[PDB]
Design a protein around this motif. Structure first.
Motif, PDB file in Angstrom:
ATOM      1  N   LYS D   7      30.820  45.859  35.045  1.00 28.33           N
ATOM      2  CA  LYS D   7      29.951  45.577  36.173  1.00 28.33           C
ATOM      3  C   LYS D   7      30.048  44.126  36.621  1.00 28.33           C
ATOM      4  CE  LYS D   7      27.824  47.648  38.269  1.00 28.33           C
ATOM      5  NZ  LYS D   7      26.723  48.336  37.575  1.00 28.33           N
ATOM      6  N   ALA D   8      30.311  43.208  35.694  1.00 22.19           N
ATOM      7  CA  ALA D   8      30.426  41.796  36.026  1.00 22.19           C
ATOM      8  C   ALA D   8      31.647  41.474  36.872  1.00 22.19           C
ATOM      9  CB  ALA D   8      30.478  40.969  34.744  1.00 22.19           C
ATOM     10  N   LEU D  10      33.296  43.775  39.318  1.00 24.87           N
ATOM     11  CA  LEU D  10      33.395  44.420  40.618  1.00 24.87           C
ATOM     12  C   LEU D  10      32.733  43.617  41.722  1.00 24.87           C
ATOM     13  CD1 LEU D  10      30.272  45.903  40.857  1.00 24.87           C
ATOM     14  CD2 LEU D  10      31.412  47.387  39.186  1.00 24.87           C
ATOM     15  N   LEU D  11      31.697  42.857  41.389  1.00 27.79           N
ATOM     16  CA  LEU D  11      31.095  41.911  42.312  1.00 27.79           C
ATOM     17  C   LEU D  11      32.049  40.801  42.722  1.00 27.79           C
ATOM     18  CD1 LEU D  11      30.274  39.272  40.177  1.00 27.79           C
ATOM     19  CD2 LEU D  11      28.784  41.148  39.387  1.00 27.79           C
ATOM     20  N   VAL D  14      35.030  41.530  45.544  1.00 28.26           N
ATOM     21  CA  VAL D  14      34.742  41.500  46.968  1.00 28.26           C
ATOM     22  C   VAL D  14      34.559  40.077  47.504  1.00 28.26           C
ATOM     23  CG1 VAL D  14      32.200  41.870  46.753  1.00 28.26           C
ATOM     24  CG2 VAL D  14      33.419  42.611  48.834  1.00 28.26           C
ATOM     25  N   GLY D  15      33.971  39.161  46.726  1.00 35.28           N
ATOM     26  CA  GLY D  15      33.857  37.771  47.115  1.00 35.28           C
ATOM     27  C   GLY D  15      33.033  37.529  48.361  1.00 35.28           C
ATOM     28  N   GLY D  16      33.722  37.209  49.454  1.00 29.25           N
ATOM     29  CA  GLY D  16      33.080  36.923  50.719  1.00 29.25           C
ATOM     30  C   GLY D  16      32.955  35.439  50.995  1.00 29.25           C
ATOM     31  N   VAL D  17      32.891  35.074  52.276  1.00 33.42           N
ATOM     32  CA  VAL D  17      32.685  33.689  52.684  1.00 33.42           C
ATOM     33  C   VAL D  17      31.304  33.232  52.232  1.00 33.42           C
ATOM     34  CG1 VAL D  17      32.279  32.230  54.702  1.00 33.42           C
ATOM     35  CG2 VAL D  17      34.335  33.648  54.571  1.00 33.42           C
ATOM     36  N   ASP D  18      31.279  32.139  51.469  1.00 35.27           N
ATOM     37  CA  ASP D  18      30.067  31.602  50.869  1.00 35.27           C
ATOM     38  C   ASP D  18      29.063  31.167  51.930  1.00 35.27           C
ATOM     39  OD1 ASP D  18      31.914  29.773  51.676  1.00 35.27           O
ATOM     40  OD2 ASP D  18      31.950  28.602  49.823  1.00 35.27           O
ATOM     41  N   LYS D  19      29.461  30.236  52.791  1.00 34.67           N
ATOM     42  CA  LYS D  19      28.651  29.800  53.918  1.00 34.67           C
ATOM     43  C   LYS D  19      29.573  29.111  54.908  1.00 34.67           C
ATOM     44  CE  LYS D  19      25.540  28.914  56.730  1.00 34.67           C
ATOM     45  NZ  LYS D  19      24.252  29.507  57.186  1.00 34.67           N
ATOM     46  N   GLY D  29      33.177  27.964  46.352  1.00 30.63           N
ATOM     47  CA  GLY D  29      33.065  29.406  46.364  1.00 30.63           C
ATOM     48  C   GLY D  29      33.865  29.973  45.211  1.00 30.63           C
ATOM     49  N   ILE D  31      33.420  32.006  42.134  1.00 31.48           N
ATOM     50  CA  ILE D  31      33.158  31.731  40.719  1.00 31.48           C
ATOM     51  C   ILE D  31      34.152  32.454  39.812  1.00 31.48           C
ATOM     52  CG2 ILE D  31      30.760  30.998  40.697  1.00 31.48           C
ATOM     53  CD1 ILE D  31      30.098  34.080  40.675  1.00 31.48           C
TER      54      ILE D  31
END
Lengths: 254, 53, 108, 169, 97, 84, 194
Positions: D7-8, D10-11, D14-19, D29, D31
């Protein structure tokens, strides 16, 4: 010229022994004992000696010990721009090359070539080098060989070499605690071995004090130094007209 | 110096904001709230003290 | 015989120009080991550079190399037979039975 | 078992733009999670099997592309155009998965190599050829192997990982 | 053994002793490098006319050299009333040549 | 290269030739029909835009590492491309 | 070689760590120039080279004479940042009150040293009692023989003010230099005689 005549007037003075010792460097105040020594090191003595054999000593070598971040650094800063072609090293790089004369590896078709090092280029130069405590034990016999007779020898991985680099060392190491013991002797605070001490002359140890008068005058002595312009102190000689003067002094044989 | 590491850096604080919006990205029902970040601290407590057995 | 020059499982890109314009990845020691057995001696009396090679050929059946040329995964079915000696004489019983050679536990 | 660790990850896939910062505040960004421990269940094919199905996540090991050849460099080529900028992993696996193993291997170059990507944006070639610097946006998944035998839990930790400053902060 | 250039062979280049047939060396107290070379000079007298075969040819040159030396005790000359094995750092057999 | 065009800037008769292997040689200037056969011959040189050029790219193969026998290592082979 | 240091601080600090959370609570949702100050300094470094008057030196000596109540390393650098702050805030000439912020920063520099290398409080006692533990057994023993099992069982437990093995090995290297003893392995030694 008149400058060649200027020496003939200046050689016919009377107090120029005291005129020279007062006109060494403005970066220090007081302590005429250390000032008398560095002048004699700056000039040369005699080197001609007995027939068929030993060449004797060429000069005198004088170190000074003292607490760091004090007036010890000022003479070191003074001489390297004042002396003819004299170089300065710290000597912490004691394992690669430099102080320890060490052959380079093969490159572009030649193994066993000579190396640099700020020791064999003190020809008419007064090399200066500090911090004897922090190096290893191997150089401490190496420069010990470099002190007695004016050559060094090397036969490291290649043919023997005899290079005659006549030299004039001048040192400034550190005490064992930063503060000099008083009731004891210097035999404990030298922080070296025994025979290199007797191979040397005396060090003229710089002492210190927390006195309420000597600080303010040294404060006033230092503030005119880093003035943008307060050149009110008059050394009776220039940098160059002292330089040619000792160049008149070297060419005798008393 | 027996078991644990860390002395509560803000670099750990900003990271726990990072993974929360990450888990808010994968499970986006537009519910960025207390329960969404309650999923987040749910993971930092079980990742930590894995040595206490 | 376990003499541990680099070549125990590799090529070292020896081509010898193969008549002016041919470069060949010459087989060191795994083309003979395939579906056979080998034996090597003196593990602790070796350098480091062979031990990194015996790591790869045990976790994986193949070596793959690109020295000055071609990446190539050639296959190998090997089975080593070992022979080493303890260090401190007859010290096995009065100490730990483990660490008794203290070569890396990557192989043990 | 081990549903906590599956579970740790799969998050982080996907990542994504932090801000979208706009101003010159390049925030951290992506981690990075590291693992440790010595099971006998062949830990390598646990992690690397995830990497060979995850997008753009290149495999690496200890041998080969070490921490000096982790970035790009200049090498020998055939009789055609030599001195090209041959790369390692991080100049090509930008914004993906850098699945590493064998963390005690070639550490003289690797210990520089891990800080320089954890530090934002300094993947460069500081050689005598050029001084150009490219991007850095990739997550790190590490698995450090312990010291001899088992990690003694009654003993002190960090007896087997050699980087205190890379870990606790 | 100085290595070859490109079309050359591993040849044999002497150092000090094979030049000095009737001369002088020095071993006083290079304390770190004492264990390095002392295993090469006390077999120049014992196994007199010594040469060696590292990675090359197995020959043996001739060198009937003479040794003098100027060793230096650790501090003063009478560092002890205790004897010479207490005074110098050398051991017996190399001293006994 | 698959076709050629030399111009001599006197007659404008572009001499054509078939392209052989990777090394070839240009011809002279006194070979044509108009700019030749006199006391003045146009000196030939090449032309780019009147010379149609093709595509070309080289690659090398290896073996699947499962149908290789137990013995020797696999070897390469050369391949070419033409057309599109 | 450096002039003044500083250390950053840390504690639990509940009123401030909560406030530091409020900073990072912000800066996520939704004159401070980028070039104007940059051209402001790069003009202002080489064009006007400012002066120094008596108005600074009178207070300057008034600081150090109470400071003596390093020597001159601190004195050379203390005017340079005093000059540059006068060069920064007033891009013309010297200031006389720029030195209260000079003594503001360096007073915070010496706050880091209230609490061996530059200190001798342990070094006014360690050389004394180690000069005592030689003279006693050398008046008991007719020889100079001192073995390694005696010295661990003599000086590790006479007093618990000295570390076990971190400073006893370096305790003997200075006695190696001060005509007392010699080293013969991790065993037998040889001491001084009369």
């Amino acid at each position: 010229s008149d400058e060649i005549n200027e020496l003939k007037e200046m050689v016919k003075d009377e107090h120029i022994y005291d005129k020279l010792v007062r006109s060494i460097a403005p970066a220090v105040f007081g302590h005429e004992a250390v000032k008398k020594g560095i002048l004699l090191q700056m000039l040369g003595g005699v080197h001609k000696s007995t027939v068929e054999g030993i060449k004797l000593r060429g000069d005198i070598n004088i170190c000074v010990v003292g607490d760091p971040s004090t007036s010890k650094s000022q003479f070191l800063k003074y001489v390297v721009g004042f002396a003819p072609r004299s170089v300065y090293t710290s000597g912490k790089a004691s394992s690669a090359a430099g102080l320890t004369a060490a052959v380079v590896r093969d490159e572009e078709g030649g193994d066993y070539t000579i190396e640099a090092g700020a020791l064999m280029l003190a020809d008419n130069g007064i090399c200066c080098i500090d911090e004897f405590d922090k190096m290893d034990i191997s150089d401490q016999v190496a420069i010990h060989e470099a002190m007695e007779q004016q050559t060094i020898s090397i036969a490291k991985a290649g043919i023997h070499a005899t290079l005659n680099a006549r030299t004039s060392i001048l040192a400034a190491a550190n005490p064992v605690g930063g503060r000099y013991n008083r009731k004891l002797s210097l035999r404990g605070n030298l922080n070296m071995t025994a025979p290199i001490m007797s191979r040397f002359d005396l060090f003229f140890v710089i002492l210190d004090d927390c006195n309420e008068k000597i600080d303010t005058e040294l404060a006033s002595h230092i503030v005119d130094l880093h003035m943008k312009r307060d050149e009110a102190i008059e050394p009776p000689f220039s940098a160059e007209q002292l330089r040619r003067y000792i160049k008149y002094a070297r060419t005798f044989k008393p | 110096s027996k078991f644990s590491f860390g002395q509560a850096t803000p670099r750990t604080l900003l990271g726990i904001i990072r993974l929360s919006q990450a888990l808010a990205k994968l499970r986006l029902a537009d519910m960025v709230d207390i329960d969404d970040v309650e999923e987040a601290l749910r993971l930092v407590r079980v990742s930590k003290e894995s040595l206490y057995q | 015989t376990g003499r541990g020059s680099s070549g125990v499982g590799l090529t070292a890109a020896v081509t010898t120009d193969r008549e002016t314009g041919e470069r060949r990845l010459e087989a060191g020691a795994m083309v003979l080991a395939d579906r056979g057995v080998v034996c090597i001696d003196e593990f602790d009396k070796m350098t480091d550079v062979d031990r990194v090679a015996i790591h790869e050929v045990m976790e994986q059946q193949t070596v793959t190399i690109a020295k000055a040329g071609i990446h190539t995964t050639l296959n190998a079915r090997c089975s080593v037979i070992a022979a080493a000696n303890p260090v401190f004489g007859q010290y096995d019983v009065n100490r730990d039975p483990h660490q008794n050679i203290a070569l890396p536990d990557s192989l043990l | 078992g081990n549903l906590d660790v599956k579970k740790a990850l799969l998050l982080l896939l996907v990542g994504g733009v932090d801000k979208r910062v706009g101003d010159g505040m390049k925030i951290r960004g992506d981690i990075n999670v590291c693992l440790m421990g010595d099971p006998g269940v062949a830990k390598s094919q646990l992690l690397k099997a995830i990497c060979k199905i995850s997008p753009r996540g290149v495999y690496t090991t200890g041998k080969g592309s070490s921490g000096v050849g982790l970035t790009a460099a200049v090498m020998k080529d055939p009789v055609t155009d030599e001195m090209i900028l041959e790369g390692g992993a991080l100049v090509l696996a930008d914004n993906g998965i850098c699945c590493i193993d064998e963390f005690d291997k070639m550490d003289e170059s690797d210990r520089t190599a891990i800080h320089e990507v954890m530090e934002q944006q300094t993947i460069s070639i500081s050689k005598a050829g050029i001084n150009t610097t490219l991007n850095a946006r990739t997550s790190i998944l590490a698995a450090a192997n312990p010291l001899y035998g088992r990690y003694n839990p009654r003993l002190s930790p960090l007896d087997n990982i050699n980087l205190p400053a890379a870990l606790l902060s | 053994v100085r290595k070859d250039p490109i079309t050359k062979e591993w040849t044999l280049e002497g150092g000090a002793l094979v030049l000095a047939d009737k001369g002088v060396c020095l071993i006083d107290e290079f304390d770190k490098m004492n264990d390095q070379d002392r295993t090469s000079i006390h077999e120049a007298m014992e196994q007199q006319s010594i040469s060696i075969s590292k990675a090359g040819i197995v020959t043996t040159l001739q060198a009937r050299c003479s040794i003098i030396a100027a060793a230096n005790p650790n501090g003063g000359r009478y560092n002890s009333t205790l004897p010479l094995a207490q005074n110098v750092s050398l051991t017996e057999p190399i001293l006994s040549r | 290269v698959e076709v050629i065009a030399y111009t001599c800037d006197q007659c404008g008769y572009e001499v054509f030739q078939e392209v052989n292997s990777r090394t070839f040689t240009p011809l002279s200037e006194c070979t044509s029909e108009e700019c030749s056969q006199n006391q003045t011959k146009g000196q030939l040189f090449m032309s780019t835009r009147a010379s149609k050029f093709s595509a070309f790219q080289e690659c090398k193969i290896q073996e699947l590492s499962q149908q290789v026998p137990v013995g020797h290592i696999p070897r390469s082979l050369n391949i070419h491309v033409n057309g599109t | 070689r450096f002039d003044l240091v500083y250390l950053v601080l840390d504690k639990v600090d509940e009123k401030n760590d909560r406030e530091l959370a409020k900073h990072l609570t912000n800066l996520y949702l939704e004159v401070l120039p980028v070039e104007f100050l940059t051209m402001y300094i790069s003009y202002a470094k080489e064009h006007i080279h400012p002066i120094i008057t008596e108005a600074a030196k009178t207070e300057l000596v008034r600081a150090y004479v109470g400071m003596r109540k390093a020597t001159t390393r601190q004195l050379e650098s203390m005017i340079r940042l005093a000059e540059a702050h006068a060069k920064m805030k007033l891009k013309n000439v010297v200031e006389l009150e720029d030195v209260q912020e000079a003594v503001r920063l360096i007073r915070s520099a010496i706050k880091d040293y209230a609490t061996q290398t530059g200190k001798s409080v342990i070094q006014r006692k360690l050389q004394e009692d180690l000069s005592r533990e030689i003279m006693n057994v050398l008046k008991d023993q007719a020889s100079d023989s001192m073995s390694f099992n005696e010295l661990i069982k003599q000086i590790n437990e006479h007093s618990q003010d000295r570390v076990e093995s971190s400073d006893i090995q370096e305790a003997l290297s200075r006695l190696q230099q001060e005509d007392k003893v010699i080293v013969l392995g991790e065993g037998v030694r040889r001491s001084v005689r009369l």
